[PDB]
């Protein structure tokens with residue numbers, strides 16, 4: 001990539017070029033920590049001198065630099081980033097069936113199903129969500145809540161070069177703001193749901209919604225919008241719509257949801273046929289995720305029946321309704337989830353409620369340095385929908401843990417039996433003991449998380465699911 005190529009292709013973003021038509025560019029980077037030699041560095045709104053010695057050929061910037069150094073000055077750094085990136089990796093999206101999945105809820109599950117449902121129906125590609133990155137064959141499991149434009153596009157160019165014709169990507173409501181995914185074009189576009197409350201919230205609801213529709217700008221004029229029925233009319237653009245839902249007039253229409261410890265069983269009316277679907281993952285919410293997929297997928301002449309038979313193998317996402325099926329070995333069934341909203345909490349308990357023929361006991365705490373006030377109402381939820389509530393320490397990052405517990409304690413209905421134990425290890429041990437023949441013990445807050453973060457920097461090992469299994473191995477022992 002010449003600078004001549006950049007300027008040429010992307011001229012209108014660029015305000016002023018003070019740089020040789022020459023400076024071949026070898027890579028792109030956003031953090032100083034990460035600069036290679038020859039890369040172009042993009043300075044987001046002192047460091048300039050630093051990043052140049054580290055080996056930077058030139059630097060993008062939003063205001064006048066005034067330094068001896070080769071620099072493209074742009075109208076909007078962050079946008080520019082996306083766009084450049086798309087070039088330097090050479091638009092990896094044209095060659096690969098790309099999927100973007102946004103919504104308030106169900107991003108990860110829906111994306112992961114797509115992923116699973118393609119590999120499983122034979123095929124090779126790549127997924128990239130919050131919870132699971134699989135870069136080609138590799139499941140490079142690691143640090144992916146802080147990806148930018150370059151990291152995503154990077155990872156789509158491994159996919160294509162390594163010969164996969166599809167990339168399944170979760171489009172965070174966050175990420176549409178960054179503009180992380182602005183240099184992309186998607187072949188399909190799933191929009192799962194939208195909350196009218198004050199979950200996932202920026203402005204009013206219209207600002208909240210509009211920003212989530214933007215995805216469909218970023219959509220190939222070839223490809224399709226896969227929409228929730230309840231958002232039918234909101235679709236302000238002019239492209240292919242496929243609806244799903246329960247209304248009798250949605251393109252794909254899902255029916256008799258039947259959640260049980262074997263999983264969600266539902267019945268989906270495709271607009272050419274009709275079929276049983278069984279996912280193994282538990283939760284009624286899992287039917288609008290499944291439906292959204294069998295739609296998007298089958299909107300490319302994949303035989304439905306066969307797609308539907310895919311979902312059978314899908315056993316949820318690690319840390320999301322993870323049943324410790326290995327607990328029946330005692331006398332109990334145990335659920336690990338990650339719920340850190342009043343909301344996910346409620347959904348969970350209702351589902352364990354439906355599915356559980358017995359008492360439901362809930363171990364949870366709250367994370368340091370999220371909302372301080374959404375805390376006592378998290379307890380409020382659990383105080384209602386659960387027979388016994390065991391309150392334990394979570395990841396009190398910065399926060400002093402006993403100054404979290406106070407905040408949580410207010411929402412507990414003091415009339416019902418609640419129990420407070422500040423050591424997660426003992427909370428869990430206890431709940432297993434006080435719970436009976438065939439009760440359900442649910443542990444929330446953490447999920448697949450691998451350490452408990454007490455100190456900003458000082459953290460001990462604690463895998464929620466595993467400690468459970470540990471205590472069970474120990475009880476059975478004697």
Ligand SMILES: Nc1ncnc2c1ncn2[C@@H]1O[C@H](COP(=O)(O)OP(=O)(O)O)[C@@H](O)[C@H]1O
Pocket residue numbers: 103104105106107108109110130192193283285286288289339344347348
């Ligand atoms: N279609 C849906 N409608 C309502 N709630 C959902 C849906 N899909 C998932 N959820 C719930 O929302 C929470 C987060 O969903 P998740 O699959 O993690 O998407 P995200 O990655 O956007 O959080 C989960 O605890 C789950 O119970």
Ligand SMILES: [Mg+2]
Pocket residue numbers: 107108130
């Ligand atoms: Mg998420």
